[PDB]
Nucleic acid binder design. Structure first.
Lengths: 89, 82, 201, 68
RNA sequence: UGAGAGUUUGAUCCUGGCUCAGGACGAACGCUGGCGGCGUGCCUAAUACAUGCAAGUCGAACGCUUCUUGGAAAGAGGAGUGGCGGACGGGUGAGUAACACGUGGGUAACCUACCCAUCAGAGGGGGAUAACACUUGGAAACAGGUGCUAAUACCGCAUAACAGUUUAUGCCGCAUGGCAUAAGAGUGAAAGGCGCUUUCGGGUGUCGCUGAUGGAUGGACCCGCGGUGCAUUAGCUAGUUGGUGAGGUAACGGCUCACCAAGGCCACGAUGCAUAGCCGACCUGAGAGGGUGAUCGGCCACACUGGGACUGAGACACGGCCCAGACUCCUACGGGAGGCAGCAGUAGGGAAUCUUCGGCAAUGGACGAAAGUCUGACCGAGCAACGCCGCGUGAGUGAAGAAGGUUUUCGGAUCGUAAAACUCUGUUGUUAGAGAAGAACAAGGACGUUAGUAACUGAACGUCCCCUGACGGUAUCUAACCAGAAAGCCACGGCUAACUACGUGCCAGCAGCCGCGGUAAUACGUAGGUGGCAAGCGUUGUCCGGAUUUAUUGGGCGUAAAGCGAGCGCAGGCGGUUUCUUAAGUCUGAUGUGAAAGCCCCCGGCUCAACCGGGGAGGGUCAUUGG
């Protein structure tokens, strides 16, 4: 059950998140496999940076996003590309 | 036990143990019943070889021996009769 | 804490003015206390390095932890010397910028003006006096309420305006043109005694 | 001491109030008067009491600040 | 980026020890305290634990039963069978000197639920049981007996070999052997639920079910090298070391058996005893080094003490079972119950360490189609100068020096522009108004596109409406009022910055090292003054530096400490000149790896800074291959 989920990295009331691919048994801030982009809930139009050439490779191997990761992966047009590669060939 | 779900696992696993042991003993006696007839040199010697093979195979689909144990068993028996 | 004492005993103990040449050492140029006029024998070469350090620390009214951190920071430049870069970083703090510009007579007054929230850098207010003013940033006088008694009068009487400070007396904007130099900055005390004082800290 | 080993200890200041079976607190510090003493008791920390004239270094000797 | 000083003498030079000047800390305690920000807080008894909470969920797998609106459909409860989860998350460092850990490799000796892809199936039967109803023994915990009942519960029969194994063929590898193709023999599975079309339609969407193969992810085993004291610890081993076969395991193997032999390890430190979880990292040092393994991340081990298995993809199981032991508790004496090293909390030990708080709004986790239900993980709040950082307790003008204190040679000097006096300020304080970001979403409605269809429902993402904040009326911003509420601790003979009075008289007392005190004490105790730091300041304890005082960097042995009383010599250490060769040391290039967070370099955000984020370098005694 590989996942693609968020990981908290702020101070106390100014949170920040790294987008990371981890085994689902791991702790939220513990071990992971690799990091895939960044996400900032402040900064009114929220800031996303991500590689999007590893997201498409993990997605095709059975990794699965959480609910917020799917929202910010569709705002970037990554889910459409998965759609157009899988069920189109 | 304290948790409600820990109390159910006790009876569930007790029942699983009961039937698991029954079926393992079935398999073991089938095999031994073949061995005691190949050590005598008796007529009706291929039929109980067949039956022992079938016994092992059915035990492997009931989640009682892994799958490699079954390959090992069928190999050993094959080298004894056929 | 900062300091509130008589502020003039301090100059009589360093042997330097500290207040824009306005004379605290006019009468009685000796030290305070009973044993003032009756001086005594020599002073060590520890007393000399301590006296130089205290001269510099009391010039700009800061505390010992902050002085030492600023000194440790100036040591990471490696472009020039280490006492020059120190005394130049010392000048770029928002309190000296208000003193040099001319909106205040003393440095204590300038400190209270920047503390009580009457000045702005680039339009935005800034309240804390240890701020680091960079080169080319017009610091202003809170165009909300720039009609105060003392600021007005202390803009008129310009005792000292330097060769690195720019200013216009109508909008009340000032800025540093570029970084100063030792010839332009107290070539009287030191920067080598102070560097030695921190070698064995 | 709590760990049941015995030592002698100097009691400083001018005038104390220590009697048999009163509980006290020790710190390090060796006196150069006689052998066998390597500790100081600390004034004003348990049954022991601060000295009652001091005006100048009351943080030692355990004296509180007087309105005088 | 390498600073030194005092102290052996009547005086000296050298040798030499002792002491001091710098840092830091999960710190404790004495005197004293105004605020915000970010962090930290049982180091001792792995001591014993009152009270609450920390793991459940599914009615779209199955039969029952109770209500609210005699036949009625929905909504809300109750236990039961069945699935999945409970092996994660959270705690602690007692054991462990060894493949436990770090770094580098190997498995042609291996396993893997949920998740992604591909191929092929999904046929037809049977016998039960809890619940329920009645009934017996029970102090209770709880046990039995009779009768009826369901399924994705259970069991056989069919069909399937793509799996394993053997034979021939071809290619290949580092022994054992590996891959692909052909045959031959015995054998092995499976389950439905919810929808759409419904002329009988017999079709179909979706989620589940069985067999085989890949990926991913997680685990298992073997090997090189590296990190502790003692020789006032030299011998240790009898499944011990190797072979043959048999059993056994996911798997190779003395892993375990029967037989055969007499081997294995050790001065390059075996064995024993003592102490210790290991690492990224952290403190200090010019470096080489030395000392620690607390917050945070990774690996390991344990769960009242000691044995065992069962269920399961995975446990020899942290809020599971069975037995033994100590301890505590309830009993009608026949018997029963329990395990805070989860979060709070308590008694005890100690110099010493916090609230029996709010919420699942955010991030992660379990189950469910989903709304949702659970979550002391976690996000917030409370306590404590325990630490780091930031800002205050006013600002300007102000004299022949007001009164008072201290001193005085009695003229004066110093506290002192310091107060007064005049004009200003409102960071803070108080009162009054306004007032956030953290929120993205699931679900629900309409609308489009693509691949499947006889077709529609649905699948997979796009566009639009709609919907949610514990902190909390918190941060913050605006208006008025007032210098009004907010400074202490240590030192002042030399090291080492800062001196005069009075009291006392080898007393009372002081000291880090020199050393002070017997009538004019700058060394004791007070007052005036002065110096260092400052919401803190000193003291004790622990570690590195100074210490070249264990000297590789970097010391010595005539008289200061120090050449065995002398030879002979096994092992070891080191060795004359030269031609060709090799490539073990040595030098050098390329590739892989040395996690994240830290120290450092550049850049950016919180009014600044602590702090937070993005991109880099660095760190191996490392491996492979080429010179």
């Amino acid at each position: 059950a590989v996942k693609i989920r968020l990981k908290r990295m702020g101070s106390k009331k100014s949170p920040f998140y790294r987008i990371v691919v981890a085994d689902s048994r791991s702790p939220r801030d513990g071990r992971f496999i690799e990091t895939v982009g960044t996400y900032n809930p402040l900064k009114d139009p929220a800031e996303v940076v991500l590689k999007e050439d590893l997201v498409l490779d993990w997605l095709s191997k059975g990794a699965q996003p959480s609910d917020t990761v799917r929202n910010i992966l569709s705002k970037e047009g990554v889910m459409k590309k998965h759609h157009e590669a899988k069920n189109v060939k | 036990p304290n948790i409600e779900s820990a109390i159910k696992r006790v009876r569930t696993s007790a029942n699983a143990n009961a039937k698991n042991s029954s079926q393992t003993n079935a398999m073991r006696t089938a095999i031994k019943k073949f061995e005691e007839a190949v050590a005598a040199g008796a007529d009706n010697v291929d039929a109980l070889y067949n039956e022992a093979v079938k016994a092992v195979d059915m035990a492997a689909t009931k989640g009682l021996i892994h799958k490699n144990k079954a390959n090992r068993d069928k190999i050993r028996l094959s080298k004894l009769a056929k | 804490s900062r300091y509130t004492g008589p502020s003039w005993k301090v100059s009589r103990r360093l042997g330097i003015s500290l207040s824009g040449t306005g004379k605290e050492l006019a009468r009685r140029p000796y030290k305070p206390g009973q044993h003032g006029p009756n001086s005594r024998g020599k002073v060590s070469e520890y007393g000399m390095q301590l006296t130089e350090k205290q001269k510099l620390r009391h010039m700009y009214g800061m505390n010992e932890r902050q002085f030492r951190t600023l000194f440790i920071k100036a040591s990471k430049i490696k472009e020039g010397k280490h006492g020059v870069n120190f005394m130049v970083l010392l000048e770029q703090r928002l309190d000296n910028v208000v003193y040099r510009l001319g909106l205040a007579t003393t440095r204590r007054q300038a400190r209270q003006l920047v503390n009580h929230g009457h000045i702005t850098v680039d339009g935005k207010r800034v309240d804390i006096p240890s701020y680091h003013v960079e080169v080319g940033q017009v610091i202003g006088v809170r165009e909300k309420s720039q009609n105060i008694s003392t600021i007005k009068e202390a803009v008129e009487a310009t005792v000292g305006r330097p060769a690195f400070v720019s200013f216009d007396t109508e909008k009340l904007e000032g800025s540093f043109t570029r970084l100063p130099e030792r010839d332009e900055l107290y070539p009287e005390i030191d920067e080598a005694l102070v560097v030695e004082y921190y070698n064995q800290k | 001491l709590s760990n049941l080993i015995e030592v002698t200890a100097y009691i400083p200041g001018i005038g104390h109030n220590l009697q048999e079976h009163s509980v006290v607190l020790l710190r390090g510090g060796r006196v150069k008067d006689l052998p066998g003493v390597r500790y100081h008791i600390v004034r004003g920390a348990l049954d022991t009491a601060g000295v009652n004239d001091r005006k100048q270094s009351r943080s030692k000797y355990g004296t509180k600040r007087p309105k005088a």
